[PDB]
Amino acid sequence: QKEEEARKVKSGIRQMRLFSQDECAKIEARIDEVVSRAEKGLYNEHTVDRAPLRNKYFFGEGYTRGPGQERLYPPGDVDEIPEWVHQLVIQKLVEHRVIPEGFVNSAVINDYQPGGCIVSHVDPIHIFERPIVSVSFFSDSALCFGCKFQFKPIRVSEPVLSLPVRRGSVTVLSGYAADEITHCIRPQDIKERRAVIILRKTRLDAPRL
Numbered sequence: 001q002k003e004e005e006a007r008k009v010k011s012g013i014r015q016m017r018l019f020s021q022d023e024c025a026k027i028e029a030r031i032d033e034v035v036s037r038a039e040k041g042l043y044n045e046h047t048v049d050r051a052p053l054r055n056k057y058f059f060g061e062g063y064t065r066g067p068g069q070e071r072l073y074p075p076g077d078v079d080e081i082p083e084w085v086h087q088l089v090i091q092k093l094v095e096h097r098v099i100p101e102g103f104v105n106s107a108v109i110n111d112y113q114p115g116g117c118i119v120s121h122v123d124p125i126h127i128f129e130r131p132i133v134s135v136s137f138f139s140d141s142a143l144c145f146g147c148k149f150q151f152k153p154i155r156v157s158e159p160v161l162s163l164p165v166r167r168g169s170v171t172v173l174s175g176y177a178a179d180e181i182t183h184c185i186r187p188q189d190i191k192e193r194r195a196v197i198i199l200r201k202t203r204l205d206a207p208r209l
């Protein structure tokens, strides 16, 4: 089951080292700008989610009381996907045939401090179409799958799979890896500042406030 679930997971994963060090550095400077702007109060209420070791910045579309009861906000509640995201990031993904033109209407920047993390979850299937596309910046890390170990540590202490995520790499989740298994990130795998950009398409018939 474990080696067999790893196979099934790997089946729904795709990765490309798509961004040079130089491109990563250009995008990383822009990510810093977004942090500065948020701090100057320039963004709408629901654009910035601040947690202790994790800040999240929602563009294009955002989502919210009850587990798996995520609801989209009136678009207009979150800020526009900025121009540098479109041109530095989404354009390159469109160019290299990772996703089609017009797919993306949601870009979320997660900014991680050292020892930051994200607990076990599935990207909510009722809000987002598949595939989920993520691009990494500032440093290398790892994305874990099958995150039972975070909650039941006597029985188990390793994930079903651990996937390295390099600076400048693109990770694309679908089928089994996006739908039938959790993913998470461990504090121990974020040794220095990491940021990731998550590019998604919301469902038309996604539930809404």
Ligand SMILES: O=C(O)CCC(=O)C(=O)O
Pocket (backbone or CB within 6 Å): 110, 118, 123, 134, 143, 183, 185, 196, 198
């Ligand atoms: O930080 C990452 O690479 C993944 C985070 C994540 O799974 C999410 O925000 O949906």
Ligand SMILES: [Mn+2]
Pocket (backbone or CB within 6 Å): 121, 122, 123, 183
């Ligand atoms: Mn996720």
